[PDB]
Design a protein around this nucleic acid. Structure first.
Ligand SMILES: [Mg+2]
Ligand SMILES: [Mg+2]
Ligand SMILES: [Mg+2]
Ligand SMILES: [Mg+2]
Ligand SMILES: [Mg+2]
Ligand SMILES: [Mg+2]
Lengths: 205, 123, 118
RNA sequence: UAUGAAGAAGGCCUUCGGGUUGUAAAGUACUUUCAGCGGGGAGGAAGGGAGUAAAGUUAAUACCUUUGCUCAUUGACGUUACCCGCAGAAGAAGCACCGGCUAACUCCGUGCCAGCAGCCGCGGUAAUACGGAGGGUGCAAGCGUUAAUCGGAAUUACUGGGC
């Protein structure tokens, strides 16, 4: 239910580095960018049509560690919901508790912030939630658990959160170790390199 | 074509016939190997394909193919067969499930091991 | 103990008397700086385009501290050194992505100092 | 989980220079979900019973029955939902595929042999198709095969076909 293999392999695969690893040490130093893995990786692979669609879907999933089965349920909900499906699907992926904690700054990585949620270190509206897939609703207040705050990893993750342009729809609190999920995010804020219309066609085939 | 002609004789939903009639729309069926022998492939190919004649529980008598290298199969062997025809062997529409009942798993299988009933090799 | 980062920006203060070279990140947090005055050049030597290039050579530090590689270029000030310094960054092994002038140009704002009758 | 680059060794390839595995590891900080253990702890529970006092109900308001109350109540699940402490990364990743369709490749072995094969088809001595190795792709506590239904199939066409 979780990827446990090396991470820079996937990162160099799919290509464009998209929100992986702590984010401090230069990504290029840790590996060899612009070179897919494998002995034969050092070559130009003439990608196809299926190829492009697959890569995009795979890329999106990894950014939020969503498995196919899980991701497909998001697509079904996004199609059911009114509005444009692709942004709705992106909104649902961003609304997951583990992703929100990462953007809120309590985790160095989405995986670590997800582990923070998993390890019963997050309080939502006075209720303990340790489920990474919990859907945060607008105006909710997310507060680190008293015991959790004593974790020095969380503290260091706050420091680093400054470099990531603080998401608008998330009101982060420094010493207060809290956050307010103001509202749903919008396509503009999200990385403009995502072509949601490609995702919609691929799953509608 | 004409609606009046079509009203007189409505469209007839054609029934699609199965490629594995002896299975009677069942995924697998157990049988007893009536005969163990070898046969030759079709035209563009040349080999000594290994096939077995098997009597099923429902009385159907059919020939099934063995997809694994080597087999400890002989008279009165009880095997499990599944669907799937052999492109180059006319009249062969079923495959013997390696690693099930009295059919041993393929020796030295390392890839597609689940397709030949071979337990994971110890590290 | 410190952190590393890339994708920086270089601010160039090309004053008539001195050249200020500062490398910083996209959020304005400084990583390193070097000046012509601090490179052994005083008086007239502190303004010549050459000495400005030399100041960049000093700024070539922070490499291990911060693998900037690609960096932006901000240039403000009419003084000499609006060309030299830029070359030195290339020869130092950096990827100059954009080059824009950020010289403060008032739209008839404050009154300037009187003229030097000399 | 993060740090972690003589890109460790080892593996394989090799244009013998290298690359590849792979920051993967090791190591170094960090955390302990659940599973380990311990200690608490809802909710499901409404009930009737025993009493009381009044009211309706009477010849007698005895009989009741209606209120209110008072005492004591009941949980199969159940070592419950949940909460709190304990310790230490410790106890938890496979499966299929990589010739085209169709994402993902070489080396070795084999030599129309053995074999694979949904379709196209491979193999006859330099096999991206078989077998093994490395590597890579997909899915994941599941992955594959098989069987079955619809779709694609405008391929029984009323929508929606032809002679
Ligand atoms: Mg599941
Ligand atoms: Mg537990
Ligand atoms: Mg391909
Ligand atoms: Mg089928
Ligand atoms: Mg039809
Ligand atoms: Mg026609």
């Amino acid at each position: 239910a979780r990827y446990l293999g090396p991470k820079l392999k996937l990162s160099r695969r799919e290509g464009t580095d998209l929100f992986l690893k702590s984010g401090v040490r230069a990504i290029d130093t840790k590996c060899k960018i612009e070179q897919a893995p494998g002995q034969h990786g050092a070559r130009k692979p003439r990608l196809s049509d299926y190829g492009v669609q697959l890569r995009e879907k795979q890329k999106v999933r990894r950014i939020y560690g969503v498995l196919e089965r899980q991701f497909r349920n998001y697509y079904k909900e996004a199609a059911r919901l009114k509005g444009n499906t692709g942004e709705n699907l992106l909104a649902l992926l961003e609304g997951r508790l583990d992703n929100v904690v990462y953007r809120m700054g309590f985790g160095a990585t989405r995986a670590e912030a997800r582990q923070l949620v998993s390890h019963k270190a997050i309080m939502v509206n006075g209720r303990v939630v340790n489920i990474a897939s919990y859907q945060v609703s607008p105006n909710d207040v997310v507060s680190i658990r008293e015991k959790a705050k004593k974790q020095s990893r969380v503290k260091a993750a706050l420091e680093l959160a400054e470099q990531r342009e603080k998401p608008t729809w998330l009101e982060v609190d420094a010493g207060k170790m809290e956050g307010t999920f103001k509202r749903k995010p919008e396509r503009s804020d999200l990385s403009a390199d995502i072509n949601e219309h490609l995702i919609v066609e691929l799953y509608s085939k | 074509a004409t609606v009046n002609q079509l009203v007189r004789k409505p469209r007839a939903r054609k029934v699609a016939k199965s490629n594995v009639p002896a299975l009677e729309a069942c995924p697998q069926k157990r049988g007893v190997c009536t005969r163990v022998y070898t046969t030759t492939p079709k035209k563009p190919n040349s080999a000594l394909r290994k096939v077995c004649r098997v009597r099923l529980t429902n009385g159907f008598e059919v020939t099934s193919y063995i997809g694994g290298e080597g087999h400890n199969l002989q008279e009165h062997s009880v095997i499990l067969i599944r669907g799937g025809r052999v492109k180059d062997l006319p009249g062969v529409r079923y495959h013997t499930v390696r690693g099930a009942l009295d059919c041993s798993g393929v020796k030295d299988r390392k890839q597609a091991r689940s397709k030949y009933g071979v337990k994971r090799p110890k590290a | 103990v410190r952190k590393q980062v890339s994708d920086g920006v270089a601010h160039i203060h090309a004053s008539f008397n001195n050249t200020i070279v500062t490398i910083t990140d996209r959020q304005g947090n400084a990583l390193g700086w070097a000046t012509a005055g601090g490179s052994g050049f005083r008086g007239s030597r502190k303004s010549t385009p050459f000495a400005a290039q030399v100041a960049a050579e000093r700024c070539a530090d922070a490499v291990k501290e911060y693998g900037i590689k690609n960096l932006e270029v901000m240039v403000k000030g009419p003084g000499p050194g609006r060309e030299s310094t830029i070359r030195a960054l290339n020869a130092a092994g950096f990827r100059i992505t954009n080059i824009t002038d950020v010289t403060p140009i008032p739209h008839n704002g404050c009154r300037p100092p009187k003229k030097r009758r000399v």
